[PDB]
């Protein structure tokens, strides 16, 4: 009376995962092995991580890339939620680097092209696997890289940033460790940047046993480059490991890079914002809400610096919405940004937004 989910006899626990226990499943009849994430409904009920697990399920569902661990099925029982996935014999790329040495230039690149390939597919689907590390990059029998924990992944939205500063300290981007909000893919490039370092060197580019000093190292963007390293790869790392996101390499910038280009298999790839006010951030919110009330617009308060304002069209009798988020530019200045909230016909949505916005600017400060 051995534990099994259908014809898959469950075996050894290969890991604990971001969410649930990952066990092996060798098929009773065919001997086919699968990896099974067991999300215990007794533990998932507990938090509001219920969303963070519906996010992993939903994202991963439609994917099918050669270097992303495949989701075969997701089966729900009263007890738990099982996620049947493709199983690989090689385990952690991390343990491979530990056990074997640093990877040779040829091998380092081979594996890097694969990890970047998967990472590209992800972004191309507006999915961003925050928490990219060799611990989450698995190897198969002929050691092809396979991306694996989409628990800390997230769906990129049109006109929206993301805060959740997640992932292992070493592999976490300066803006992540800093807590500042990012677009998404910059972050995965900075992680893929350290992965390449670990590949060619066998060590980490930013490391310290004291966490805050490590955080400073990461933000200083300064790391060692051994003599054995090729200057061309050094230049690529210099670009991926840029502290400023606006100066940091893009997947395109990497595809364009000569080091990355060498022996690449073809199967892998195919005016100013808002109004700025120098007033007190609380006083700005105060100034805005008495101006919103003036325009008779309805609204709801999310964050103290975030408002969702609605407006009944006096002519077409239809509703128009916008997101008002206060930011901070200088050490002395503050900026108010107007984003459109696309509803779901008699008069244009786009122009109705401009009108709603202009009506406010007509009275507000600088």
């Amino acid at each position: 009376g051995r534990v099994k989910i259908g014809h898959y006899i469950l075996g050894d626990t290969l890991g604990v995962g971001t969410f649930g226990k990952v066990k092996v499943g060798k098929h009773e009849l065919t001997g086919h092995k699968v990896a099974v994430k067991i999300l215990n409904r007794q533990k998932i009920r507990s938090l509001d991580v219920v969303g963070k697990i519906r996010r992993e399920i939903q994202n991963l569902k439609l994917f099918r890339h050669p270097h992303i661990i495949k989701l075969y099925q997701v089966i729900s029982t009263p007890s738990d939620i099982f996620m049947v996935m493709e199983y690989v014999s090689g385990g952690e790329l991390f343990d491979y680097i530990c056990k074997n040495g640093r990877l040779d230039e040829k091998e380092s690149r081979r594996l890097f092209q694969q990890i970047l390939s998967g990472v590209d597919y992800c972004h191309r689907h507006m999915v961003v696997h925050r928490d990219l590390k060799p611990e989450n990059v698995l190897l198969d029998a002929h050691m092809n890289a396979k991306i694996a924990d989409f628990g800390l992944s997230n769906m990129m939205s049109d006109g929206e940033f993301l805060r959740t500063s997640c992932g292992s300290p070493n592999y976490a981007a300066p803006e992540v460790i800093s807590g500042r909000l990012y677009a998404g893919p910059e972050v995965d490039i900075w992680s893929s940047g350290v992965i390449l370092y670990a590949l060619l060197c066998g060590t980490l580019p930013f490391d310290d046993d004291h966490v805050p000093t490590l955080f400073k190292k990461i933000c200083d963007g300064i790391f060692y480059t051994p003599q054995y390293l090729n200057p061309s790869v050094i230049s690529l790392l210099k670009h991926m490991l840029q502290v400023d996101p606006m100066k940091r390499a893009t997947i395109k910038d990497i595809r364009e890079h000569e080091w990355f280009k060498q022996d690449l298999p073809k199967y892998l790839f195919p005016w100013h914002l808002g109004i700025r006010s120098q007033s007190r951030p609380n006083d700005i919110m105060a100034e805005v809400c008495r101006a919103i009330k003036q325009l008779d617009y309805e609204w709801k308060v999310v964050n103290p610096y975030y408002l969702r304002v609605r407006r009944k069209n006096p002519v077409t009798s239809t509703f128009s919405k916008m997101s008002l988020q206060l930011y901070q530019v200088d050490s002395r200045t503050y900026l108010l940004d107007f984003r459109s909230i696309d509803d779901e016909r008699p008069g244009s949505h786009t122009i109705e937004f401009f009108e709603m916005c202009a009506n406010l600017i007509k009275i507000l400060a600088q």
Partner: protein, 161 residues
Amino acid sequence: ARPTVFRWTGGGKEVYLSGSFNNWSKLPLTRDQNNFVAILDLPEGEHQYKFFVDGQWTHDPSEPIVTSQLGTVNNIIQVKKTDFEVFDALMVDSQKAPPILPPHLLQVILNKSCDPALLPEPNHVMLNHLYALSIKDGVMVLSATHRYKKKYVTTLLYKPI
């Protein structure tokens, strides 16, 4: 196949599971690492069970009980239809200073000799955002890039104020 995992987060050398679903017969729980486990496919409905933990019968006090008219205390499980749809099962489980301006909202596609009515593919992150020109001869110029399907359109409103 949708089997229900029974767990025994207790101690013990030998643990068994007796249920209505197996006609009150001692089914052995396999010691995982932490708990003693068994996985059985149980149909939609009410099911009572108990545990034989080291020659002593008990319910899991953690799990719901049911006391009979006869004095027997058994555990109980309601296997609902909701317990099978992955997203339906997800819903049933539910029950200081302003941020620093991200650098991506400073890059304007209107700012940066082909078509004058032709612009580059904008970064998704600035779609729906309001960028306005300084108020001139009593005229305020407003712009926003929006996407319709695989196409992007930067609309410019020339509005007197």
